[PDB]
Every structure is written in structure tokens, then in C-alpha cells.
Amino acid sequence: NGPEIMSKLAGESESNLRKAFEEAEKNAPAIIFIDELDAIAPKREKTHGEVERRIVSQLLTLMDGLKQRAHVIVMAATNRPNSIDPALRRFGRFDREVDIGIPDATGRLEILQIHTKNMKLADDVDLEQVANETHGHVGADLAALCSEAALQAIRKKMDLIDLEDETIDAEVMNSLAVTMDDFRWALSQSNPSALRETVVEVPQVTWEDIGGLEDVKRELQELVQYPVEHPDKFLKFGMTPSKGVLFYGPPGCGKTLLAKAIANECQANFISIKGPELLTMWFGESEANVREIFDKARQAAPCVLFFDELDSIAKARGGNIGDGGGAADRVINQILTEMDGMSTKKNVFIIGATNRPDIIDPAILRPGRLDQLIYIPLPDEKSRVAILKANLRKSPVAKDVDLEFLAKMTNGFSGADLTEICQRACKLAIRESIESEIVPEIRRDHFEEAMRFARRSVSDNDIRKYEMFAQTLQ
Amino acid sequence: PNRLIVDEAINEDNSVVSLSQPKMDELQLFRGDTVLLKGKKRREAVCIVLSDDTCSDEKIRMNRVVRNNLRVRLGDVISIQPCPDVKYGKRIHVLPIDDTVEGITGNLFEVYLKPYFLEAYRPIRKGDIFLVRGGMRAVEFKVVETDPSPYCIVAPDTVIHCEGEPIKREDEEESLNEVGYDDIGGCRKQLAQIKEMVELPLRHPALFKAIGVKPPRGILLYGPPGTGKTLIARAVANETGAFFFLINGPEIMSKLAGESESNLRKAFEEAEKNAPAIIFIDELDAIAPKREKTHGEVERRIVSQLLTLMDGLKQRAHVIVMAATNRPNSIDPALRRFGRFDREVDIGIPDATGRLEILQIHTKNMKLADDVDLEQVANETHGHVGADLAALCSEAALQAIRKKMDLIDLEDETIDAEVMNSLAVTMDDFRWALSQSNPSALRETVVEVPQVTWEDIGGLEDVKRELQELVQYPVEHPDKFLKFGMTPSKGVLFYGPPGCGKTLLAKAIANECQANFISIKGPELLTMWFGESEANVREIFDKARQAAPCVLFFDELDSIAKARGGNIGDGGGAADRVINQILTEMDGMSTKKNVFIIGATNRPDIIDPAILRPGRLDQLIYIPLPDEKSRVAILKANLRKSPVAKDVDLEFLAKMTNGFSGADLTEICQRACKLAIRESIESEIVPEIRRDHFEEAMRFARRSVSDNDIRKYEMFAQTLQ
Amino acid sequence: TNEAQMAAAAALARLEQKQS
């Protein structure tokens, strides 16, 4: 590990590193694990000391010596593949890389189950519920979470039994159950170490969660699955598979869910880039970070890289009128460059979404980029019913609630607007339930009252704007 | 039987122990009865049991003096029994401790023991230690001989004797002037959090080494200098009995290459040999600063050496390393990774209540005059930390001392106890010291529970209820939100005319919820925009998480949109640098951190619509100009503390001020006060604010919100339907 | 007994002075 080698004096750090390789050879087959590699051999441009420069060169020569040190494999751990001397990653040496990433909701449940194997849990403990709440945690944080929950349970009993001796009674610990209240307390004390890290995971959104859009669902399967499920037909007919599709249409119609649902069915990692991230790069003149986004997509492949609010910068530049320049800007140009350098053989599919297609840099729509365009309209009557059922799928809706009549009334509503009705009715049911303790279901009265405030967010002036664009594309 | 846990006391009185009423009936004793407490090494203490409404049913609350007499520590268990046959004594012989009476001479009985014993009816047992404060000294005494035995109550006719040499302190008896938990004023929440983390593995080491659950190994305390980071570390070690080893940056960095690394390693070896032990590293940023900020071989090596020593704590059982820094991000990020320093506590700056507690602590030995009001001082000492309040008390003491010493002219090697004992520090000496003191945390972020309550806000009855639903229900009734599949709102935006109470609403709900209030004002959002330092938004939202539960209030949310031209604007759109970072942080924030975001704007028509989407400030509340019944309530609230004459007709004023905002009604209240002050001052060259003062104030006060601006808000509210 | 009752009145009075 870095600290062990770097804490030594000049002439001792290089010697100890050499000895480690000699010991592994004598005991071959052997694995040498170098943790905190960035502390031993950081990028050369970031250091000028003689000790740091020598230890970089010494590690490089020891790695090259592995041509003779048969059956010795050297593994290393770093935070970023570009924090270390690029020489280490050249043919030979450290020429294989694996991206461990951050556990997803399923992995977090598995980690919680592992670090509770020895713990007696009460019947009210639900580790899946915990795994869903522990957003941004890594395994080290879930291990600390289980430890803190255990200690809270221990304190509650130990202060009551008052048994102080040299050893612990096995029966006392064996009958100690950790309740959900102790996990909830530990969750309040835990502080995730990866809260601001990029989240890359297979989305839990499935096609059953999206109302309507039956034809788009089929089209996306043809765009995303066929090039890899039936590659021999594309070669046979000389077809060049599309690299991505742009969604356009009114806001709140399911553009994001479509990208997630196809990523889920394909079991591909979903990478979400939101408007504020594209604006952050534009505002701070840090568009170079686009290269790391597309490189992450390659690392996580197969994956779907979704660029939401693709017009966020065009709007920030004035949108309807704009400024003194043209459609091109700093961030989109880096997106265009990375797409041109990306091969379809990496199984990375690019999806965009915009609420204002009339101000998207036309370059993104040329062959080789987001050449396919799908219109996502406001849901029709049969779709709005499906949307209400999907949004209420987990709610205790009373049998007296007529969702077909509601769909008829909400003629001009988007899917997001139907959700506001669903959540507003839920809020009303909660308020009444809480008051009854100072109710078992969401009653028709709650949905009827919700309709007093819910409104369509998409006006007819904006609907025509989308129709005119769609008509241009045939 | 009758075995209760030893807890902390609120009453400092050395002869009083607090027990909850149900234990008075189980022990069959009456309120104020005399009981014995059974401690360790066949020792006991006699005290009077009183009841209160704060003691836990299963705990006994006793101060440091009683615990030391019993040779017990917080968290232990002692037995309590009544002793109704206690009688009075006639003779008590008390001698001072050699280690506490130094440099001071005089009649110890008249100064210390007489006011302590006389008519106090204290129980005393042979061998008891007790502390008497006065004359700016803390002098402890031991009782060596009494006529009755083993204990008695001192009567008004009991004679107190004191002859012989001072008593040499026993090696197993700690001085009562050592740092303990009762020396810490504010930041009680942080002290409790730390105690939970450290007291269990230090008091019960057999628990952790016998189970698969590992203890915390490293706790990083952070906050401005002078906030008690070292004071806590010392109090913890002294209260639990763990061996305390002190490290500080200057001591390690002043050494040569090969000596600094060796001395740091030795510190860990010494703690292990004396385990359980606490290693406190002050000025950690001076030892292991962020690597990107240093390139020297000595600084790089000492970072690596500390990291390896912290990792060695897997074998160094029962050793906890605490560190103090100014900022959690000033040090090598490696230190904060799993293990090492993976627990953090934000000490912060004491609030008005904590500052009063600190002033009371650092005046325990001081004789204060009847005109001294430490609560008034605590309210004036904005921006001060405990180190500054300690200096404030010292400066006030010295000013009082100089005034008397220059008059009595007594110069000798020792000081007369009577001279100091009769020296009272007046409010003028504290006010003088306040003018000389200079707060060290004047520009630091202020995070505290607001003193604004609902009684301070006139009108808006429906908004008050709405905030309770938005802020309290998601955490008081979480099972209903899960049951109905509801996603709690993350925040609300207030919009409406200026001066209608938008800020008070955010403070009042934070107060009722007992949550920390963080105020971000227009100039701060503009500073980040103008200086292209919008990255500082991440630190604001991270502070909200650190201080949770809290309410993070963004006032003047349109300040940048207006700075960009407002009504016309510039060549861009609604988005800007600072609001974009706010949007990013909100999206990454979970409702499980109990952080509620509130915004306020006077120009909702120019707020970036992104902030109003689900997941952001999706709720919108309109705060109108107050109506007639509200304006009366506003006048009464603003005048709540003013000596308003009975002839002032506040309902009549409310009828006239039809178009006034709450801020405009305040100008009337303050303008009338100014007029009353002017007349009062002139009368000395008046006892109340007269109708004439309010009538004259009405000659200048005008509505600040015109009808053109009222419609602007109504049209927006209509757009929201 | 009565000496404990006299201590009771004195302890209660000092507690009220500290709480007020």
C-alpha cells in the first residue's frame, strides 16, 4: 500500500518495493496487490520530487521484470484510471483494467445480507427497504451501517442486564435481536462516501410502467436489440446500424422512461446525463468532461447513455431568440466528436431527449449521430387510463375510483400531469389518515378534490410546435 | 436492589442528588429526605434527594463531586438507600487541599466554609471532598474529623474548625478543577453524539473484543478555532478514565526529518501500552494537509506515517484517535476513508443559548453584581466562540480588579481572600470588555435553531398549517407516506410582495421543529455568481446535511435574474451558474436526511422554471399583503416588546394602513419608538409610547407595494391555478 | 427524621434559586 512504501526514506521505499516482487517470485504462484497506487506512482506531471520520480521508474521496471517472474500477477487499486503514470497502462505491466463501480440496489441488498450473517434480526427488519434507501452508499458504508445498527441494539440491552465480566455470555448475544428502528437510526447516522459519484446501473423501470406508446416500445427494440441479437442480417444486407435516437415532444410524456425501460429489458447499464450537468460543463468551460462521460459508457458497456434536456444550453443562450452565435456550442461539439469516434461494436446506444427540437444543433441529427427521431405525443384516452393504472400500481386505490372517467376528463393532460393528480390524491388521503389518529384507502373524494387543482401543463400553442416539426420529418 | 445508573446532573449543588418521583415511592422516601449512596472500594456518600421533571426513571443524577467521593464514573451503577436517622453534628473539622490553596491567604472559614455550611443543612460524611467557589478561585476541601460518625447534617450552631497543614492529594483522587463534561456549555448535541461513540468501547472493552462488531477507531472534530474541540477530547478522557495523549501540529512539525515521524509513532505505542487510551491530534491540517497542497518530503512522509499508524489500530485494541481540524476537506482525503478517521462531528459555533451557558461556566468563580445580565451579553456576543467568551469574562474581571486594587494598595506575595471575595464585577465592566473583545468567527456561517415562533407572525393562519404538513408529517408519520406511495416534497417556494413575512415563516417552522436554520441571502448568491464561484453551493448543501435536521432557506432567489437585467434581461435564458448548482445539489439530496429546502422570491415571473419541477421546489405558497385582522396582529407582534401606551388604538391604525405590508407596519412601530426616545432624552436636558407618537409616525409612513405590483403577483398566482 | 426535614427545606430552596 502507498502509505507503507511512501513513509520510508529514500533508498528504503525503492528497496522494499523490489523485495515485494522477489518474495512473490519465490512463493509463486503469487498475487501482489498494490493498494492506493495513486500514492506510489501518480501521474508524472503532478510530481517533481526525486523520491516520487524514482519510485515511478522502479515500479515500471519491476512490472517489466514479470516476463521472467513466472506465475506472478500484480493487481493494483486506484480511484481513477487516469490518476497514475500513463506508462503503467502500456502493453504489458497494467494492461488489463476492471471498473468495479458502485453496487446497485440489488448489490446493496446482497452486501447487507452478507454483513448480517452473524446478526440475529427481528421480524420487522427489511433489508431490501434499507438497500433502496441507501442511495450513494458503497460496501464500506453498508458494513458501517450494519455495525452501527448492531451497537444500538447492544446498548439497549447491555444497560439493562448490567453483566460485567472478562468474557461475554453467548446466550445474551444470541437472544439479542436487531430491530428496524436500529437500522433506521443507523441510516440517520451513516454518511455515504460516494454521494456525488456517477450512478451506473440497470434501471428498475420496465415496459409495464409505461402507459401507451405501444409502437415506440416496438421500435426501440428494433433499434437497440436487433443489431446485437441478429448481427448476421445487418451484414448480409449491408445495413449500418443506427448509433442512437432522439426523443422529441411535450414534457412529461415518458421520454426518460422509454430510455430506462429498453435498458432494463436489454439488461444494459443506464447512464443518466441531466440538463444541469450539460449546463455545468457549458457554464464552467469544462466541456472536456464529455470525453469522460462517453468513456464511462464504454467502460460500462453494454449500456445506454441518455442525454436529457439536450436543449438546456440552447435555452440558456436565449432559446427563442438566442445570442450572437449559431446552434453549435462547446458541450454539444464534444458530444459530436465522441459519438463519431465510438464504434457500434462496443454495444453502447446513445439516446437523447429534448422538449424543443427546433433549437437542437442539426449536426446531432446527421447520419452517424442521433439520426433516428421518435415523436412522443401527449397520451390519448386509452393511454391515459394505462398511465393512471401504472402511476397508481403501488397505491391503495379504493374500488370506487373510476380511472376511465378521470382519463376522459384529463383530455389535455400529460403523463406527468396525471401523476400530479395521483400524488395529490395520495396526499389528501394521508392528511385525513393522520388526522384520524388525533383512511385505509384512497377514496373517490380524494381524486375529485385533486382535480380541483390539477391542470394541463402543455398548451395547444406548444402542441402545434411539435406537430410542425414532426410533419417536417414525415 | 435499588441499583441505578449514574447520570449527569443539572443541579450543581454538591449536597443534592436528583431522582425521578417513581423511585421515591419505590424507596419509600419523601422529597428532600437524606439517603446514602454506595460506591466502590467500600465507600459511600450522604446527600439529599430532590425530584424534578427531567431525571430518567432508572437513573440517578449526581455531579462530579459526588461521583468522585464514591469513586465512580458516568455509566456505572450504584445503590441508593434511605437513612432517616441522620442527626446533626456539633463539630466539623475541615482542611484545604494543598494542590488548590496556593498564592491565596486569609480567613478560609469567613470566605469559603462559612457561607457554604451556615444554615445550609448539608449532609457531611467523614472523608468527603467538596468544592467552594469564590474570590475568582475554586478551592476544594476535605472533611477530616467530626464528633458524630460516620455522617451528620451541619446545623446553624455547628462550629467549623480548620487548623493544620494542607492535605496532600491522594494519587487515586482526581482534582475537581480538571476538565469534565460540566465545563462544556453549548454544542451539547455533539458531545452526546461523541459520548455514544467512545464511552462504550472505553468503559466496557470486554464487550467489543468479544463480539464481531468493531468499535469506531477515529473521530474527526471540526469547526472554527476556540469552539471546544480540545475541551471535549479532554472531558471525554477525564470522565471515562482513558489515558490521554496530546499531539499537535507544531510539536510534530518543529522536529527534524526522522524525528517527526519517530515521535508520531511513539505516541501510538504509548497509547497502546496504556490502553484504553485516546490520542488527540490538534491542528491536524498542520500535520497531514491535502496532498495537492504540499510537495515537501517531510510533509509527504508524515502523511503516509499517520495513515499507517491509523491502520495499525486494528491491532492496537481499545485505542481511539481523535483529531481536530478547521475544515473536513483541508486534510489528506485518505484519512477519511473506511477505518482511520471515518467518523466526523461538526462542532460549529455556540448559539445564543450555548453562549449564555459558556458565560455561566466561565463566571462560576466570579462574584457578579446584581446588575450583571449574562443573557443580555450572550445575545450581544454575535460571532463569538467559547474562546472569545472566556476572554470576555477575563477582561471583565481584570477591569473590576484594577478599579479596586488601585484604591486598597495592598502589595504582598499572596492575595487576601477577603479582598477578592468582596469584589463584584458589574455590568459596566462586561460592557467595557465587550468593546475590547473581537470575535474570531465573525464571518463564519451561522447555523442555529431560530428564536422566531408562530406568535411573532401576524396572520397567515393557513400558511402556518401548510408548513406543518410539508415539514413535520414526512418524519412524524412516515408509515402513512409509505402506505399510500406518496413522495414527500423536498421544498417549497414562497412568492409575493416584499416584507410580508416570508423569512419569518421559514424561521418559525424551523423553530417549532427544533431544526437548524441556515440563511442564504441575496448578496451571497450574487457573490457566487459575480465571482464565478458557484461551486460553493455544494458546501452550502453539504453544511445542511451536516447540520441536519435543518431548514435551508434561499432568500432573494431572483437576485441574480435581476442582476442580469430582470424585466428585460440579457442575451441568455433563465438558467445561470448559481441556480444550476442549486438544482444539481437538490437532485442528489434524499428526504431521509431531514433537510427541507425553502425558497423566497419577490419576482416569481423570473425564476428559472427548473426549480419548480417535481423533486425541487414543487410546492408554491402565495404570501399576500395582510388584511385588516392580520395587520392588527402584525402591529401587536411588532410591538410585543414595546412599552405601548393604553391610548394607542392599533385597530384604527390597521384600518388606515390598508395597502401596507408587514414591513411597512414595522416602520410605523419603530418610527413611533424613535419619537418617544427623542422626547425622553430631551426631558433629561416619556415612560410610554403615546398616541401622539404613532400619529406623527403616520405622517411619513407609506405603503411600499403599489397596485401595479400586487397585480403582478395575482397574475402569477392565477397562472398556477 | 427532623434533621432530614430541615435539610429538605434548605435543598429545595437552593434548587429553586438555581432553576429561577
Ligand SMILES: Nc1ncnc2c1ncn2[C@@H]1O[C@H](COP(=O)(O)OP(=O)(O)O)[C@@H](O)[C@H]1O
Ligand atoms: N407514458 C407514461 N406512462 C407512465 N407514466 C408516465 C408516462 N409519461 C409520463 N409519466 C409520468 O411523468 C413523470 C415524468 O416522466 P419523464 O419521462 O421523467 O419526463 P421527461 O422525460 O420529460 O423528464 C414520470 O415520473 C411518470 O410517472
Ligand SMILES: Nc1ncnc2c1ncn2[C@@H]1O[C@H](COP(=O)(O)OP(=O)(O)O)[C@@H](O)[C@H]1O
Ligand atoms: N463550548 C465551550 N464551553 C466552554 N468553554 C469553551 C467552549 N468552547 C471553548 N471553550 C473555552 O475556550 C478555550 C478553547 O481552547 P482549546 O480547547 O484549547 O481550543 P483549540 O483546540 O482551538 O486550541 C478554552 O479555554 C475553553 O474552556
Ligand SMILES: Nc1ncnc2c1ncn2[C@@H]1O[C@H](COP(=O)(O)OP(=O)(O)O)[C@@H](O)[C@H]1O
Ligand atoms: N406577518 C407578519 N407578522 C409580523 N411581522 C411581519 C410580518 N410580515 C412582515 N413583518 C415584519 O417585516 C419585517 C421583514 O419581514 P421578512 O419576512 O424578513 O421580509 P422578507 O421575507 O421580504 O425579507 C420583519 O422584521 C417583520 O417584523
